[PDB]
Amino acid sequence: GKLFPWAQIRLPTAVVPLRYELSLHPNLTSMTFRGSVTISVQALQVTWNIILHSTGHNISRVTFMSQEKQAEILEYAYHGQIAIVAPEALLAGHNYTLKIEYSANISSSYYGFYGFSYTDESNEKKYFAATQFEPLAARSAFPCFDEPAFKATFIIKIIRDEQYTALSNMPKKSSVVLDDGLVQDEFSESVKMSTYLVAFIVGEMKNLSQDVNGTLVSIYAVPEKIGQVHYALETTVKLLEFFQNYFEIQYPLKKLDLVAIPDFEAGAMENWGLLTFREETLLYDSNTSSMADRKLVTKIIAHELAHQWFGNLVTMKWWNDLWLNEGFATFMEYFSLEKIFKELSSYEDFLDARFKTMKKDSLNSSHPISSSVQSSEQIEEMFDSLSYFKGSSLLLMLKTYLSEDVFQHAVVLYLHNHSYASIQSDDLWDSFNEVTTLDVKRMMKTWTLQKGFPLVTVQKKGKELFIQQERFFLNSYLWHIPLSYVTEGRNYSKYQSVSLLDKKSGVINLTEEVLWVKVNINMNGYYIVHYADDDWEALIHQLKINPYVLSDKDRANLINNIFELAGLGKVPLKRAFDLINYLGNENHTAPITEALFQTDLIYNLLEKLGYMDLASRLVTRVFKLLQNQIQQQTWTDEGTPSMRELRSALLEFACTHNLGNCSTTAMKLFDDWMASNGTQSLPTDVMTTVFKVGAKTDKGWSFLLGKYISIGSEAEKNKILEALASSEDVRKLYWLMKSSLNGDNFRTQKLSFIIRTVGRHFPGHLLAWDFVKENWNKLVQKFPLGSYTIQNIVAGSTYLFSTKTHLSEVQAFFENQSEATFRLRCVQEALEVIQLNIQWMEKNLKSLTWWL
Ligand SMILES: *[C@@H]1O[C@H](CO)[C@@H](O[C@@H]2O[C@H](CO)[C@@H](O[C@@H]3O[C@H](CO[C@H]4O[C@H](CO)[C@@H](O)[C@H](O)[C@@H]4O)[C@@H](O)[C@H](O)[C@@H]3O)[C@H](O)[C@H]2NC(C)=O)[C@H](O)[C@H]1NC(C)=O
Ligand SMILES: *[C@@H]1O[C@H](CO)[C@@H](O[C@@H]2O[C@H](CO)[C@@H](O[C@@H]3O[C@H](CO)[C@@H](O)[C@H](O)[C@@H]3O)[C@H](O)[C@H]2NC(C)=O)[C@H](O)[C@H]1NC(C)=O
Ligand SMILES: COC(=O)[C@H](Cc1c[nH]c2ccccc12)NC(=O)[C@H](CC(C)C)NC(=O)[C@@H](O)[C@H](N)COc1ccc(O)cc1
Ligand SMILES: *[C@@H]1O[C@H](CO)[C@@H](O[C@@H]2O[C@H](CO)[C@@H](O)[C@H](O)[C@H]2NC(C)=O)[C@H](O)[C@H]1NC(C)=O
Ligand SMILES: *[C@@H]1O[C@H](CO)[C@@H](O[C@@H]2O[C@H](CO)[C@@H](O)[C@H](O)[C@H]2NC(C)=O)[C@H](O)[C@H]1NC(C)=O
Ligand SMILES: *[C@@H]1O[C@H](CO)[C@@H](O[C@@H]2O[C@H](CO)[C@@H](O)[C@H](O)[C@H]2NC(C)=O)[C@H](O)[C@H]1NC(C)=O
Ligand SMILES: *[C@@H]1O[C@H](CO)[C@@H](O)[C@H](O)[C@H]1NC(C)=O
Numbered sequence: 001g002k003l004f005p006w007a008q009i010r011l012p013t014a015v016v017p018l019r020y021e022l023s024l025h026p027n028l029t030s031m032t033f034r035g036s037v038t039i040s041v042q043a044l045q046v047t048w049n050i051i052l053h054s055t056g057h058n059i060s061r062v063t064f065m066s067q068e069k070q071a072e073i074l075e076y077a078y079h080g081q082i083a084i085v086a087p088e089a090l091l092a093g094h095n096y097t098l099k100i101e102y103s104a105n106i107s108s109s110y111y112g113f114y115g116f117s118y119t120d121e122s123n124e125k126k127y128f129a130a131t132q133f134e135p136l137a138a139r140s141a142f143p144c145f146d147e148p149a150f151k152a153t154f155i156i157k158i159i160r161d162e163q164y165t166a167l168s169n170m171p172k173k174s175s176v177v178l179d180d181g182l183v184q185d186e187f188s189e190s191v192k193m194s195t196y197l198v199a200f201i202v203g204e205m206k207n208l209s210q211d212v213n214g215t216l217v218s219i220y221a222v223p224e225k226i227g228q229v230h231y232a233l234e235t236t237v238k239l240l241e242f243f244q245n246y247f248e249i250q251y252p253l254k255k256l257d258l259v260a261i262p263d264f265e266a267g268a269m270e271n272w273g274l275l276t277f278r279e280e281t282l283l284y285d286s287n288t289s290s291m292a293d294r295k296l297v298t299k300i301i302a303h304e305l306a307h308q309w310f311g312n313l314v315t316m317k318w319w320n321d322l323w324l325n326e327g328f329a330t331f332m333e334y335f336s337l338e339k340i341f342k343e344l345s346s347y348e349d350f351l352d353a354r355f356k357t358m359k360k361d362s363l364n365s366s367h368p369i370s371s372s373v374q375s376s377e378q379i380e381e382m383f384d385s386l387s388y389f390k391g392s393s394l395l396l397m398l399k400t401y402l403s404e405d406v407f408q409h410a411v412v413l414y415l416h417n418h419s420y421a422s423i424q425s426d427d428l429w430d431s432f433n434e435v436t437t438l439d440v441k442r443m444m445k446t447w448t449l450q451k452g453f454p455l456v457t458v459q460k461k462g463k464e465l466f467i468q469q470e471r472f473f474l475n476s477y478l479w480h481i482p483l484s485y486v487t488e489g490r491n492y493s494k495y496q497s498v499s500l501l502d503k504k505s506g507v508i509n510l511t512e513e514v515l516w517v518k519v520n521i522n523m524n525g526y527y528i529v530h531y532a533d534d535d536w537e538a539l540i541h542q543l544k545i546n547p548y549v550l551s552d553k554d555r556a557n558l559i560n561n562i563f564e565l566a567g568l569g570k571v572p573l574k575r576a577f578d579l580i581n582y583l584g585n586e587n588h589t590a591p592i593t594e595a596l597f598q599t600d601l602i603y604n605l606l607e608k609l610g611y612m613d614l615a616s617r618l619v620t621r622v623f624k625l626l627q628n629q630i631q632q633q634t635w636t637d638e639g640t641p642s643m644r645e646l647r648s649a650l651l652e653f654a655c656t657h658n659l660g661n662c663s664t665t666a667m668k669l670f671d672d673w674m675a676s677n678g679t680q681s682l683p684t685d686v687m688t689t690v691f692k693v694g695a696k697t698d699k700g701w702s703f704l705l706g707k708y709i710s711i712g713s714e715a716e717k718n719k720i721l722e723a724l725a726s727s728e729d730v731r732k733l734y735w736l737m738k739s740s741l742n743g744d745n746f747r748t749q750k751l752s753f754i755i756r757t758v759g760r761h762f763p764g765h766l767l768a769w770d771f772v773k774e775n776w777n778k779l780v781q782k783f784p785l786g787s788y789t790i791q792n793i794v795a796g797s798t799y800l801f802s803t804k805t806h807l808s809e810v811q812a813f814f815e816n817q818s819e820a821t822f823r824l825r826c827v828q829e830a831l832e833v834i835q836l837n838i839q840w841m842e843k844n845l846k847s848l849t850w851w852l
């Protein structure tokens, strides 16, 4: 009771961790554990108190090791900090060794060292423990310096029962039977790393493996699935051979372990050496899995294997620069997939994700990509689309402005100079300046330190393009925007070129008279282009004549930007429906999915406001544009991957709004699969549509719930859950959320997926927002504040409100909560989403009733 000696969230810099040794004896029978942390520290200045991070620990002994003395420990729970009062002052340059012995519980949630139970194929209950330490949960398990810049080497010693296999970051040195009959395994010392990338797993698993030039790649899973792990190994082996070639640095360890965990809230984690996953994101079966499920296992493996360089070998100094980890990993994920997995058309997801990140970055709720964070909530809210898909778009803009070979050299320089060290945003731009003349550092200062993105307005007047730049915002700093443009002349000849606008306005000369100009080729740039109308009509005439003279990316780029500029008010909504009246000649996915998104959004807003005959007049006119392409659809799994994704988009659009005979066809496919008893093989491209039509009946909804609790595909289960949660019976909708929240028949990791599916359609719109409000603090006690789960639920329960009544309701609810809860950007964003729904409906409702 001597006054905690530190009042700042961030630890002192006086003492640095040098070496860590943590031995743990978890039970999982008792769901408690006992741990011993021995930390080698260096004092860089005179010190009287070691300030450490510790959350949820009963300490029995703290000690120093010429004399072995006991130390006093104090605790300031608010900041999750413990202070160790030194017996004699610590001096600079002097190494010391502290040992803390403590007890704690295994956790209730998916964060920290956590445990769960699963029933086997034999009705056998088997236990499992695992770790999720990013962002700030390693202080739950071992007293540590829980800040990423305090890199160190780690020695894990885990005591286990013989039936379990204990995995960790490093390979096992050896395992000895102790006098208790229990085994204590020990792992080789680690590379210099962050505490959040530490990981240990305890559970009954099996493995399939292959050696790549000294590294044994191992994919684990619980034994009833080990045949379901072949696609992951080969993809891991192939993507491993790709990343060690492009980055020209090798995976430094001898084990690349990928584990499929039954209860995990995120899709995956990059824990060095031990990559954790969700069983749905790593396993795959040719017979029960979509192309979209295969297009996620290859994606998620590429994302976390690129974190082994971008995030583990090179790590950010503070969470303000999380985009240097997650934005590089997203970039390298889609870069890998365009080179060695091209036929999956992974660019369509990357393109679609950028459309959605730009809508959120257009709001005043947005922030600079690298902006200061201090609280735990702010650190948890950095795991957002901006850090992932705006960082991956800054890099895609720089790779396409510079050569693809100059980009590679900045990567090789930056990974070598900063290996096993911390980095900030300006360290990367310096690596671009050494391989280039160009001041990449000032070119990227406005894309990193200002919020939003620019709007390039474009006018063709003779043989010159006039270009001006503005911030894309509705109620000053300029950007060094690399412009690209393609143009066609008197002849079908198409010319591509590039420029850099660093001033408010500019002029480009064209050495020919042109038929039309298209700026931002394939949207390699993070900006929206608005044209003058004589230049917009040129692009709309061409679309109505032969749209295939433009790329798939460029035609989805125009659909997105035209509906986006129709909200800010720069264009009339009639103009965006003018454009998409060309879709009678479109049969490629990306433009169709994007037109279907905008159509479905306007339909989902109008329905809630009671305009049901206006909403159904919109879905049938879009159905009439796409009617030829929908009726040629086969209820099979035939075609290329992108043609398979288009098959499910067109049949889900048709069946969700009861258009055509499609629901009659899906109901027959369901009624045969049900008479089978779940036996008849269904094409994986029509399963969700089939299950959704069957779930609208009490027989099919009840049959489908019996398959949920009995089938072993966690991706066909995710397809049945969408059908169940798309019921029109609000008592069934309500019972699905209440069970996921409590963990009974649906795991709590699907609650956000349920709340999302429920709140999107008319029957459960109010039920979902009410359940979130009423159970708000149960959700905050399972998913940390600012987490992706909490951000996904706030956005998807509120984004379809469009009345001043709902704006004050949502605002007043969050004001009744903590200031930290109110100041979440996901909350401020949700409010702004609502405000823009009100304005869009006053501007474009009397005329949209005219066009329709
Ligand atoms: C942690 O401390 C524990 C002490 O509480 C130690 O745990 C005990 O270890 C024994 C044997 O090592 C286990 O004995 C077996 O457990 C099963 C329970 O599950 C099985 O049966 C049910 C019922 O059908 C079934 O659903 C399951 O699938 C299993 O088949 C017993 O039924 C068996 O007969 C057998 O006794 C204990 O379960 C376990 N706990 C307790 C409370 O007894 C543990 O070794 C310590 N671990 C470490 C790392 O130190
Ligand atoms: C439709 O399919 C489900 C499963 O997909 C069938 O339920 C299964 O019924 C069999 C009956 O032999 C059960 O197998 C045996 O269960 C008994 C009782 O537990 C046990 O003594 C044996 O060890 C053996 O496992 C099986 O457990 C059960 N599975 C489930 C998930 O319920 C159902 O009977 C089928 N119905 C029709 C009409 O085809
Ligand atoms: C299809 O499902 C998903 O789209 C989920 C969404 C999601 C659920 N939960 C999240 C939490 C944070 C961030 C995103 C999520 N995508 C992921 O999970 C991604 C893998 C993708 C990029 C292929 N994962 C990564 O990018 C990893 O590298 C982080 N470092 C994970 O960070 C964590 C921080 C706090 C946590 O509690 C758990 C993880
Ligand atoms: C599961 O993992 C084990 C251990 O990594 C694999 O067995 C090892 O295989 C390597 C490969 O050459 C050998 O160097 C070791 O001597 C083996 N160790 C033991 C204890 O057998 C095993 O092959 C993996 N399972 C499968 C199906 O591949
Ligand atoms: C095969 O193993 C060798 C040996 O590690 C790898 O050679 C490395 O190549 C990278 C390429 O830049 C060098 O930076 C490393 O220094 C090399 N290692 C050594 C020890 O010299 C090679 O990449 C491996 N190939 C595969 C496919 O895994
Ligand atoms: C198709 O029209 C394009 C539009 O310019 C023509 O491109 C020009 O070709 C001449 C050579 O005949 C060059 O001197 C010009 O510089 C080209 N244009 C530009 C903008 O540089 C192309 O010649 C036409 N195709 C033919 C004639 O086959
Ligand atoms: C462990 O669990 C107990 C009871 O479940 C709880 O009261 C306590 O705060 C937890 N933490 C520690 C350090 O024991």
Ligand SMILES: *[C@@H]1O[C@H](CO)[C@@H](O)[C@H](O)[C@H]1NC(C)=O
Pocket (backbone or CB within 6 Å): 093, 094, 095
């Ligand atoms: C601390 O350890 C480092 C690494 O071995 C060594 O260079 C240094 O001399 C040590 N200092 C003391 C006081 O032990």
Ligand SMILES: *[C@@H]1O[C@H](CO)[C@@H](O)[C@H](O)[C@H]1NC(C)=O
Pocket (backbone or CB within 6 Å): 364, 475
């Ligand atoms: C926009 O955000 C700023 C701070 O980023 C805030 O001061 C202001 O109130 C917000 N609203 C408007 C309309 O600018």
Ligand SMILES: *[C@@H]1O[C@H](CO)[C@@H](O)[C@H](O)[C@H]1NC(C)=O
Pocket (backbone or CB within 6 Å): 631, 632, 661, 662
């Ligand atoms: C459903 O409509 C499509 C559209 O032309 C047609 O090809 C198909 O034969 C129809 N099937 C039934 C059962 O009416």
Ligand SMILES: [Zn+2]
Pocket (backbone or CB within 6 Å): 303, 304, 307, 325, 326, 329
């Ligand atoms: Zn990541």
